Symmetry: D2
Subunit: 481 residues, 4 copies
C-alpha cells in the first residue's frame, strides 16, 4: 500500500495516506455517497447533487493542510506525523453520523419520531466511527503506521464530539490544545468543516463564496493564551472573519433555509413518519429496526440513506399508500403553499416547546374580512428558524485570538468597535415561515389574512408584501402605517 491521489473540483489533487484510504474503503464511509449534502435543497438548486462523501474528503484534506502548515511554520510545537493522521481522520470522519437528507434527519425527523431521545449527527459520527474501526480491523493498520489506538481513538472521537466526560481532554495534553481547534472548533466555530462546505456548496449551488481559507491558513499561528496553546489569526484578518460569518448567514438565507427547500424537507419528513411503522431495516444479528430506531444499531444505520425516499416512492404495499402519496405530490410539484415570513420584535424569543401551538394561534386569529372558506390549525405549517453567528446571542469574534506582525508570539483580543461601526449589533434572530396545506385559490387568500392578522396580534414584523396580500388587514396596525 502507498498513497492515493483524488481529483476534487474544489481542492484539486488531494493526496491520501494508505491508512486514510483503508478507512475510506469501508461500507460505513462509502455510505456517505448516498446522502445529499443539502437534502431538499437539490429540489430547488439542481446543481446541488453533491453528497456528504466528497465533502468529507474535503474536510479531511483541509484538516491536513492546516496542521501541516502550523508544523512547518512552528517546529517548536512538536507536531508529529501521528498528530497529522489523527487530525485528518477526524476530519474525514466527522460527517459519518448523518442520516437521510442530512439535517432533515436529526433536525426534523428524529425530534418528531422520538421526542424522548436526544440525538445528534455528532453523536452518530462517533458511534459510526467505532463501528467502522471494529467491523473492519482498522486498529492493526493504525498501529502498523505508528498510531496508538487507545490514545488516538479517544483523540479522534474528542475532536468530533468534545470531551467524552481542569483540562477535560484525554486524547492529547494542553500543549497540543490547538489541535482540537481544527476539525470542530467548539470555542468559536472557525474550523475546516465550514471552509469546505462554503466552497463546495457555492460551486454546486451557483453562488459565489466570499471566504479565502487559504489566506487564513497562511496567517495562522499558535500562541499561548491562558496557559493553553491556541490557534491565532493575524490581526488584520479580523474583517475577513466577520465576513466569513456574514457569508455563512447569506448561504443560510438564500439556500440552506430557502422556503421551498424547507417545505420539501417537511413533506419528506411527514412521509417518513407515515412509513416508519412499516419499513424494516435489518441490523445486527438479523434483528429488525425502523427508520426511527436504526440509530440504535450501527449495522442498520449503515443501510439507512436517501434510498428510503425511493423505497417508499416505488413501494406497492397498501400500508405505505399514505407515505407514497406525499412523495408523489413532491414529484408533481403539488407542494404546501408558502404564505409569508415574519420576525419577532424586541426582546421576544420563541421556544421549542411552543412550536406545536403556533399553527393553533394562526387559525385562531380573527381577521375582519369576508372569507368563503375557513381554515383549521391542521391546515397550517409554521416553521421557526434560528439564525445566528453560531453561538446564539454571542459574537464569535470575541472568542478569537489574534497576533500582530511586530509581536508574533503575543496573543491579543480585538473588539467590535475596534473594527467597524458597520457591523451587526445583534448576532441572533428568528425567522417565522407560514405555509398552508390547502392549495386552492380561495384557501390561499384566506390563509394570507389569518397570517397577517396573527402577525399584527403578536406585534411581529410586517410581512414585506403585507399591503398587497392583505390590504384590508394592514391599516389596523399603527406601527406599520
Amino acid at each position: 500500500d502507498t498513497m492515493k491521489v483524488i481529483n476534487d473540483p474544489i481542492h484539486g489533487h488531494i493526496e491520501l495516506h494508505p491508512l486514510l484510504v483503508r478507512i475510506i474503503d469501508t461500507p460505513q464511509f462509502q455510505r456517505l455517497r448516498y446522502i445529499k449534502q443539502l437534502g431538499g435543497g437539490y429540489y430547488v438548486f439542481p446543481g446541488a447533487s453533491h453528497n456528504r462523501f466528497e465533502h468529507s474528503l474535503g474536510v479531511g484534506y483541509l484538516a491536513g493542510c492546516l496542521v501541516h502548515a502550523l508544523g512547518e511554520k512552528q517546529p517548536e510545537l512538536q507536531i508529529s506525523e501521528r498528530d497529522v493522521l489523527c487530525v485528518q481522520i477526524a476530519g474525514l470522519c466527522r460527517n459519518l453520523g448523518h442520516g437521510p437528507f442530512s439535517h432533515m434527519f436529526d433536525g426534523r425527523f428524529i425530534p418528531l419520531a422520538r421526542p424522548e431521545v436526544k440525538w445528534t449527527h455528532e453523536q452518530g459520527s462517533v458511534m459510526m466511527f467505532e463501528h467502522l474501526i471494529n467491523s473492519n480491523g482498522i486498529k492493526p493498520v493504525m498501529e502498523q503506521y505508528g498510531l496508538i489506538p487507545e490514545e488516538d481513538i479517544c483523540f479522534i472521537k474528542e475532536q468530533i464530539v468534545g470531551p467524552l466526560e481542569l483540562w477535560p481532554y484525554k486524547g492529547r495534553p494542553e500543549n497540543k490544545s490547538f489541535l482540537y481547534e481544527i476539525v470542530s472548533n467548539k470555542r468559536n466555530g472557525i474550523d475546516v468543516d465550514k471552509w469546505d462546505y462554503f466552497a463546495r456548496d457555492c460551486h454546486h449551488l451557483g453562488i459565489q463564496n466570499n471566504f479565502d481559507y487559504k489566506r487564513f491558513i497562511k496567517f495562522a499561528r499558535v500562541c499561548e493564551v491562558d496557559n493553553e496553546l491556541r490557534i491565532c489569526a493575524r490581526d488584520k484578518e479580523v474583517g475577513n472573519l466577520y465576513d466569513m460569518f456574514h457569508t455563512r448567514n447569506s448561504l443560510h438565507r438564500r439556500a440552506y433555509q430557502h422556503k421551498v427547500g424547507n417545505i420539501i424537507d417537511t413533506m419528506i419528513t411527514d412521509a417518513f413518519l407515515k412509513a416508519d411503522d412499516y419499513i424494516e431495516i435489518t441490523g445486527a444479528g438479523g434483528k429488525k429496526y425502523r427508520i426511527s430506531t436504526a440509530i440504535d444499531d450501527m449495522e442498520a444505520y449503515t443501510k439507512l440513506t436517501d434510498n428510503i425516499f425511493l423505497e417508499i416512492l416505488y413501494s406497492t404495499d397498501p400500508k405505505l399508500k399514505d407515505a407514497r402519496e406525499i412523495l408523489k405530490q413532491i414529484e408533481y410539484r403539488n407542494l404546501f403553499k408558502y404564505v409569508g415570513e415574519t420576525q419577532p420584535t424586541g426582546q421576544i424569543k420563541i421556544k421549542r416547546e411552543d412550536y406545536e401551538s403556533l399553527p393553533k394561534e394562526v387559525a385562531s386569529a380573527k381577521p375582519k374580512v369576508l372569507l368563503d372558506v375557513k381554515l383549521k390549525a391542521e391546515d397550517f405549517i409554521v416553521d421557526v428558524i434560528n439564525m445566528d453567528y453560531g453561538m446564539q446571542e454571542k459574537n464569535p469574534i470575541d472568542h478569537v485570538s489574534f497576533y500582530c506582525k511586530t509581536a508574533p508570539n503575543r496573543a491579543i483580543r480585538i473588539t467590535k468597535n475596534q473594527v467597524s461601526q458597520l457591523l451587526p449589533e445583534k448576532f441572533a434572530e428568528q425567522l417565522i415561515r407560514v405555509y398552508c396545506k390547502k392549495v386552492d385559490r380561495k384557501s390561499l387568500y384566506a390563509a394570507r389574512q389569518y397570517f397577517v392578522q396573527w402577525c399584527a396580534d403578536r406585534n411581529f414584523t410586517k410581512p414585506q408584501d403585507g399591503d398587497v396580500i392583505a390590504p384590508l388587514i394592514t391599516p389596523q396596525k399603527k406601527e406599520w402605517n
Copy 2:
C-alpha cells in the same frame, strides 16, 4: 401559470416557459434526478455526483439560446414561438430514456442481457416522452400555448431519434431543416447536448473545458446548402471545431473511459445480470418486469434508476447473495485488477461479435516464463473501446458548412489541409484493456505475462509499461526492440 427561473451553476439563471415547467414536473422527468450522468465515474471522480436531470435542463436551455439567436439574426427564417418551444422540449427530453448509471445500461447491460434487441437510450427517450405526454394530460396544455400536437409531437420525436420511417421528416418542411441540427445533429454531431455536457462534466470532474459554445452560437447563420436551409459556422471557427472534438476525445480518455471507472461499470453490470431473475419491478396494471425487461413498459422503466444498485446492496434474500457480494466488493474496493492497455495495428479492426472470444485468446497465449499459477479464460476481462470523432472513420468537419464575412449567405466547404498539417490523419481507433479477476500478487504477475505475450502474438502495440511488467517477454518482439 407563469415562467419559472432556475439557477444552474453552469448557465446561471435559466427561464422556463410554463409548458416546459409542466413537462418537468412529472415522474417521468423527475426520474432523471436518480440517474448519475457518468455512472461508475463518480467512484473515481468524487465531484461527478451530477445527474441527468440538471444536464437535461441545460440542454433545453442551450437549445433555446441557439434557436433564439438564429431568429434574432435572421427574421426571414420565420422561426415562430411554436418552433422555439418544440426545440426546447426536444432538448429537455432527449435524455429521458437513460437507465441506471446512464451509458452502463445501454452500453453494457442491455447488450449482454438481451442481445437480440437493438436498444438505445434515444429510443427509450421517445417512448418515455410518449408515456410522459399521455400519463399527464400534456396535449391540452400544448394546444393551450399554441402547439399542434400531431405535428409538434412528431417534430419533437424526430429531433431526438431521427426520421420515424428526399425530405424524410414530417414534423417540419425543408425550409426549417436547420431546426433538426440543434438538439441532436445526425449530420456531424455538433449540437447543444455536447455543449452542455462538456461544461457540466468539466465543472464537476475538476478538469477544464476547452470549448466556447457561446462564441460559436454568435457566429452561427443559416445558409442554403443543396436546397436545404442549414446551420453554418463562420469560416474562421473551423479550428475551434476541430478542437471541440479533440476535447471530446480527451474527456473520454481521462474520464468517461477511465480504466477503473469502466471496471466498476463492468462489476455493476455483472451484479445486475445475477440479480435480473430475482428483482421485480411493477409496471402497468400490476404486471411485473425484470431489470432487463423494464424497457418494454414505460411505467416500470419510470421506476428503474440507480436505486437498484442499493436495493441489491441492501437485500437479504439469499437468491441475491451473488449479486450483493459483487457490490460489496466495490465498497471494499476489492476490484478486478487492471493488467494493461494496447491497440490494434494497421488495418486491424475488432468487431463486436469477437468480443466474447478475447478472454479465451489471452488465456491461450504461451509466455516462456516460470509461473506458479495458471489462469483460465474466465479469469480475464477484455474491454474494447472505440474512440472516434463521432462518425467512425469519417472527419465530421467535412460535413460542416461554413460562410465567410464577405459573402455571409454563401455556404462553403473547408478541407483538412486548408486548416493545418498538425491535425490527426485518422479519426477512429480502438483501445483494448485487460483486467484479471484473480487479484493476488502471483495471479497478477501471471496475467501480465499472458497479456504481453498475447499482444506480441497479435502484433498489437507494446504496452507502455511492457518492459517493466514483462521484462522476459518484450525482447522476443522485434518491432518493440
Copy 3:
C-alpha cells in the same frame, strides 16, 4: 460597417453596434487603455493591471443588457433601438473623464494642486464626450443610425452627470424616467457601473465577488412610483441588495483603501505636485498646459495618462530631480511607513477643513516615553477615509422600490427591520490612517508612541496592535484597560 464582437473575460462575447465601434475607435476613448482602474492598487495586487478601457466596454455592455431585458419583458414601455443605443453610449462613456491613476487624480492631486477649482471625473466625462463627438464627426454617424443629436447628446450627458440645470431632465420625458437609473443611478447607486467593477476587480485582484447582477436583471421590472416610471426589484431580492453594498464595503476595505495602496497614491501625488511646474502638455492651438491645468483643455487632457508617471521616472532634467526621486523610492519600496489606524468615537465626525491640522496634532501629543528622536508635523501623514453605503449616513435600500409576485405592477417599500436584525445600524464611519515619512527604526518607534498617545488624547478607538507597539502608553487609558 457591421457589428463587432469583443471577447471579454468577464462577460464573454460582447456585440458592438457599428456606431459604438465608431465612438470607441477615437483617441479620446482609446486613451482609457493607459489609465489603470485601481491606480496604486496594482503596486499591492499585481493582478490588478486592468485599465479603464475594458471596464468601460463592460459597463456599456451591461447597460445594453438591462435595457434590452426590460424592453423584452415590458413592450408597453416603448423602448426604442434609439433608447438602447443612447444608454449603451452613456455606459461606455461615463469613464472618459478619469485622469492618471483614476481616483488618485480627482481625489488627491487636483484638490491639492488647484484647491479653488471644483472638479470631478463625471464633469470630465461630459467634456471629453463633447470633445470626442466634435473632433471625430460622430453627429453625422449618429443620425445615419436614427439618433437625433440635440436630444440624444443631452440624454447621454444627463445620464452621466445628472440634470445640466418639476421633471428636471430634457433628454427624455417622465415616461422614460427609468432609463436614467441604468448607467449612473443618482437615487440609490444601484447601476451597472458597480456591477462591472465588482466582477472585473475581483477577477483581477484574486478575490471573490458576492453579487449576481444577472439574477438581479432578470427580476427587474418597471413600475409607477409617484407618477414616474421607475425600475423596481422583486421583494425577495432585498437581502441580495444589502449584500451588494456589503460587498462594496469589503472591496474598499481590503483593496481600494488598502493602506499601502493609498500611501503609494499619496507618494505619486507628491511627485506630480513637484513636477507640475516643469511638465508641459500641448493642447489646442499649440498652447501649453500643466498636469494641473490640462483639465481646462480636452485636447491636452486626451494626452494626460499614467504615462506621466514614467515621463517623470525616466527624466534627466535636474528641475525634475525631486519628483523623480520620490518615484524612485516607490521602485525601491522605500515607502512612507504605516504607523496605525483608528476611528473617531460616538458622535465625533471629522470635517475636510480639519484634515490639514491633523499631522500638527499628532506631533503635539506628549507621550511619557524616552525617545531618541523627536518628530515634527511635516514628518506625519494622516489619511482620513469616509466609508459608507454610498449615501453618507443614509440607507440606500430605503430609496429602492420593490414589487411582489402577487401584484407585479404595484411598487412597495421595505424597511430594515422588515429584513433582518443582523444588518448594520449605521451606514457611514471614518477610518484614520497615520504614516511616518521618516522610515528608520528609531523614528518609527517614536511615531508609534505619538500616534497611540494622540488616539488616547482624542478618545479614539484603541489601535488593534496598541499594546504591542506602545505598551507604556496604553495602560493610561481606562476604557482600553
Copy 4:
C-alpha cells in the same frame, strides 16, 4: 527582513523569501510592470492588460513549487535551501530581458533595425540580471542567506540561457542535472514558464486552459537517465503532455498570432523604425542611445518600455511626424488590411532569407481580372509564421522520460503509436499571412486577386475564402476544383 505574501489571481497567496523581495524591489525588475505580456494582443483581447511583472512572479512561484515537491518526495536528491532559492531567482528573472511589447521587440523590431546583431530576450535577461545584481548590492544579501555568488550567479544565468560556453554546466554538477529542467527546459520545453503563461493568459484573454500543472507536479519524479538525474513523468500522463502542446498551439492560433494582433505589432514596429533616429535614451555616464541601441547598455535598457509608444504618440517634434502618424492610425483603427492566409504544400519549406522577396512575388503575379488600381511590392506585407511543438520538426514527447508505478525508479520511453493514432503526424508547419497597406475598397479587392493568384502560382493551399474573394481566379487551379 522577513517573508512577504503576494495575492495573485492565478496562484493565490505566494510567499516570497526576503532575498527574492530584495531582487524584486529594484528598478530593473519593476520595469516589467510596463511591458505587456502579449504586446499588440491587448488591442484585440481587451482583457490582456497583464504585464511581464506578474508573469515573472508566477514563474518564480511555480519554480519553487516544483523543486520543493521533488525534494519532499525524494530527500535522497539532497536538494538544499540554496538550490531552492537559486531556482526561484532564475524563475523570477528569466523575463528581465524583454523589451517593449515583449516578442514584438526581439521578434520584429531588432531584426529589422539591426540585422547584423544577434539578440534574444534570453541574452538580455542575463545582462539585465548582472546589472540588477551589481547596481543594487545584491551579492552581500545573497551570502547573508547562504548563497555562494560565484557558483550561484553562474547557476542562475545558466538556467536562463544555457551553458555559458561531457557535462557543460558549471553552476551545478550532474547529480543535480534535474534542476536545469525546471525554469527553462532546453531538452523538451516542459517548464514552469509555460505553466504560468497558459493559466495567466487564459484568465485574461477569456479562453480556457486545458493544462493541469498541479497534477503534473504531483506525478513528477527524478530518475537516472543515461547517467544524468532527470525529471520524469508518470507514464499515464503522456496524453496530458500531448495535450499541453496542443493547447500551446491553440493559444498561438487564436491569440498570440491573431492576424490583427500581429499587424498591430507590425505597425508599431514600423513606427518605432521611423522614430529610431530621433528618440534618445540616456544610459550609463550620460551617454545616449537609440531605441535600437539601448540593448547595448543596461542602464538605458532599464528605461526602455511600452512608454515609448506613448512618447511617440504624444510628441510634437516634426521629426517624429511620420512615426506619430502611424500610431494615430492605430487609434482610429485604420489598420493595414488582412488579405488572406495560406500554407506551403508537401515538402515546401520557406527560408528566412526569402522573406524579404515575398511581397515582390505577390505584386508580380498576374491575375486575369480587370483592375482599376495596380499595386506594388511595397503595398504588401507578408508575415511567415512557423508553428511547431517547440522543437521544429521534432516531437518533444520523444525527449520525455517516464516511469511506471510498478518500477518508480526505472525511466522509460514512450513512442507516439504507443499512445494514439489520433495524434498529429507532423509537428511543424508554416502559415503565411498577407496584408495590404492600401486600405480602400478597390485596392483591397485587387490585393485579394494578386494574393490568390500568387497562391495558385506557388502551388500553396487554397485560402478558405478563396471562392468568395477571388471567384474568377480559383477555377484555373485543378487541385482546388
